Design a protein around this ligand. Structure first.
Ligand SMILES: O=c1[nH]c(=O)c2nn[nH]c2[nH]1
Ligand SMILES: O=c1[nH]c(=O)c2nn[nH]c2[nH]1
Ligand SMILES: O=c1[nH]c(=O)c2nn[nH]c2[nH]1
Ligand SMILES: O=c1[nH]c(=O)c2nn[nH]c2[nH]1
Ligand SMILES: [Ar]
Ligand SMILES: [Ar]
Ligand SMILES: [Ar]
Ligand SMILES: [Ar]
Ligand SMILES: [Ar]
Ligand SMILES: [Ar]
Ligand SMILES: [Ar]
Ligand SMILES: [Ar]
Ligand code: NA
Ligand code: NA
Ligand code: NA
Ligand code: NA
Lengths: 295, 295, 295, 295
């Protein structure tokens, strides 16, 4: 037998950093969870109990904290690129660093209509994420995402004209609830290395803001024919607004809200145009996925 | 042996209601999880397999949907009181209804600076809750709460002058991070029945808003001597602002953010005044509780 | 305003202890999560920012590890009593210690039919718990429990003869699935102090074993008229088997498994006697509670 | 813009099936969660709002229940193969069916040392899983796994001789705790279709039992040089025992148990040979991955 693939490192590394403006007294906080997994000439750690080739996961943890101390942690695409570049440059026998970052929301509080200098609220479980693959000889592959963006619209969703056969019970509808948890990923053009990433730094926050704005406006404004048709329009618009993105991927649950027939009770009318009270379904759920790229 | 206490019913009943203004086309959505547990002359269902005294949990579920269809679901204090009153009035042998409601946030989207008529975002897992105990002959006991309000301040928290003995390692600090998940409960004056609850309906949204605004402002502005001292200021302000509340309870985790000594690495200075990078601690956590009443 | 009630301390303290028999080389492991909340003359920490009365939660954490080092961690009733007694005895102004322990399962592996000296498996998220309230002048109040015991029987459950009115849709059944997550608590006679707890130490493991064995056997053998009737039989048997218990409490969800009518598809028969395929329901769930004492 | 990739279907489909032996009265239960995602000529559902190409996710849900009614649900490799084959055969324009199954443990209860005919316990959150990719023209690709197998050994784990540089603080150890959640996957030789899967049916349960037995014995018996070296020996042994497997993948967290230095307290000795009480770490964790194949 032989090692066909191996990666190892530290997962679930919680990191906080504060920036303090001494003149203005304004503080800014960043919180993330970091995973770094390394590849390279490490097969003998598995086959021959040779630990000499292991950079200890505990050392990888220390390096994440040291990197946060000595570099900007924003945007996460940059921090991930710096972190991954460190491991392949520092260690000759390490050839790849896979960096996953989840960013947690700390939104500045407004108190009496004025932004507070050092108080923050977690205003959603929505995350901004990166996957940064730094591969020696092959540059830096970045996937940026937002996830856990939970939305609902109470009308202007439809689902009719789907295939009907002996497996089909679902009634066509011209007015239903649509609710999802938005998982949207944009894949960047391959970067040659850390210098190229640094040259595009302003595009990271700008493309995240674009992806979020397009997601929310399209969801709110689309008279939706299907999750499929709505998510495609989001992906189209994002591609049109950032030439350095090669693909946009959506993964969207259809979080079903079922009508409740109450006509068995005193002829209560709670379906179609009279539908007021619904049963949100925890499971099952539709799961709809698309990767959109350029002609 | 004998039944000293019994209650039974349906838990985790997910409910959605929509209001449609056909005039303005503005829709408003409400989503909640409901628990109803009944007490009364039900001992014989346990002792003698006498099901005649059981209002089926399935029927309690149906009753929750029917009540939502025929009544306002807001404020939850009112909806809980109506639901509880229904069971003790409908069924001679049912003497108490315990109604627990978790209200889920559906905040109207702003699209291009304008509130959207029928699109909503879950802005955080913060909940508004009620516990409504409807007890035949003894009226209606309401506890209102907000929970899962997650906040952090980067400075203006201190902890010094605490007891020091052979069990103490904690360093006194004059400048630390304070972060918590706010659980705040206000206990209402006993209400004689549904009529008295109805007569105070506007005070429920008002007092929730007050509790939340006092919580956020006190957290942001208090140069905190301790979790204990800060939470007491929140409770005393809420009591002073609503005479119909008897007590305010706070349950606050101290979600620790530890300094990381990096001086072992190239003399890096990341402690005291130089503290930038911290390790958020998942566990353990301080847990600090107070019930405040009128002196 | 004034403090009506206060308690504070450390929650989510994860503890592991190993016992090593150097003679046999057999090792035994114990893993628990501990919460300690103190009450006493602490009002001034809330009202006057007087930290002198605070035993730091960090110090309570240290005390938990020190107590584990210097005492048996089993049975948890004993460990809880020692820990609670420590705080009210060590500190003149501390008058109550509330100790909550969750015991995690580490079951010794059998390898090739022989128990392994130092390898363990988590055989299920079932927990053994204690709540130990040590109150100066009022002794030691212990509640013992098992929780997260998940069971299902495929037949020999019934539910018929329940109240039927205009809110009822549920069909009577003479043959259904019954599945639950067993939460069972036994309340001990008040103990005068740690000496009285020590004097009953063997009864703690014995009564836990009895409660679990009665639960499993009654569930498997009762041709169940209802959750109510079955849970009462468990409680009365446990009371009859341990005179030092005053009450037995059960809290049991009814985790519904719905029949699926497939007759719309090729006349497929999957209801009543033909029921093979079911839809397990995540929510809602029946919730059935009983406290049983001596008549 | 254009669709580069698309799949859609129903996720989180909870399924129960009972087998009843009428002669012996013995019942056997199977519980799973099923996900089916379809690919094919569906791009126009995204680009042109053409629902005519959609087999409704609700219809996919119905088909999962119907398939369970008309076929064996065990082994899951067979059920997944039948389910996936159905969708590509039934619908001309559907070219791939991706079937993910999680199997939940329902272990027969022993009552008074005799297996009960119809009572079951969830004896762990351990899962047995399959991923079945049925691709028209390209056959059936099966990955089988066990996951959530939580184990600990209190000694006979070591970690020394790893790389030491200016990032390294971790002390070499010749005796530590090792605990993990085992995620082990075996990848089958490509199958030409459902007939070939049916011809290997007995190998599925046998290879799962082998993978589990090898995992537990190797973990218990290996005097471990590293997670890397131990997981490699597991993968080797499994490959040696089933020629129809091409690869074995392990993904193993290192769930750290930290020594607690108590020497600051009355010279208490709780490190190295005196280490009895440990702090289990929730995060971070080592994450170690290997895919092992044949020379
Ligand atoms: O938007 C939808 N897409 C689907 O594919 C689907 N299937 N059922 N309902 C659905 N809704
Ligand atoms: O055992 C049961 N008890 C109940 O009270 C009930 N109500 N619906 N179904 C039920 N099953
Ligand atoms: O605010 C705090 N209160 C406490 O009681 C405490 N104990 N340790 N740290 C603490 N911080
Ligand atoms: O088994 C281990 N493997 C590793 O790679 C490692 N790193 N720190 N500790 C470790 N333990
Ligand atoms: Ar950070
Ligand atoms: Ar959508
Ligand atoms: Ar609602
Ligand atoms: Ar606070
Ligand atoms: Ar322990
Ligand atoms: Ar039961
Ligand atoms: Ar099943
Ligand atoms: Ar291992
Ligand atoms: Na390198
Ligand atoms: Na009544
Ligand atoms: Na005392
Ligand atoms: Na096909």
């Amino acid at each position: 037998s032989a090692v066909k693939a191996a990666r190892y490192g530290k997962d679930n590394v919680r990191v906080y950093k504060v920036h303090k403006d001494e003149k203005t007294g304004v503080q800014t906080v960043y919180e993330m969870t970091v995973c770094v997994l390394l590849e390279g000439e490490i097969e003998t750690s598995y086959t021959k109990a040779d630990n000499s080739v292991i950079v200890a996961t505990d050392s990888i943890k220390n390096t994440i904290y040291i990197t946060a101390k000595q570099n900007p942690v924003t945007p996460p695409e940059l921090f991930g690129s710096i972190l991954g570049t460190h491991f392949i440059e520092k260690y000759n026998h390490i050839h790849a660093a896979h960096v996953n970052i989840v960013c947690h929301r700390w939104t500045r509080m407004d108190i009496d209509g004025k932004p507070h200098p050092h108080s923050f609220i977690r205003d959603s479980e929505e995350k901004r994420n990166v996957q940064v693959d730094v591969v020696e000889g092959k540059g830096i592959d970045i996937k940026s995402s937002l996830s856990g963006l939970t939305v609902l619209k109470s009308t202007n969703s439809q689902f009719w004209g789907f295939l009907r056969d002996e497996y089909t019970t679902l009634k066509e509808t011209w007015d239903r609830i649509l609710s999802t948890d938005v998982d949207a990923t944009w894949q960047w053009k391959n970067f040659s290395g850390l210098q190229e990433v640094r040259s595009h730094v302003p595009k990271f926050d700008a493309t995240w803001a674009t992806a979020r704005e397009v997601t929310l406006k399209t969801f709110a404004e689309d008279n939706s024919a299907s999750v499929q048709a709505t998510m495609y329009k989001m992906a189209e618009q994002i591609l049109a607004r950032q030439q350095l993105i090669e693909t946009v991927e959506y993964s969207l649950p259809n979080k079903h809200y079922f009508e409740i027939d109450l006509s068995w009770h005193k002829g209560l009318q709670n379906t179609g145009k009279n539908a007021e009270v619904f049963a949100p379904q925890s499971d099952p759920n539709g799961l709809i996925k698309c990767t959109v790229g350029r002609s």
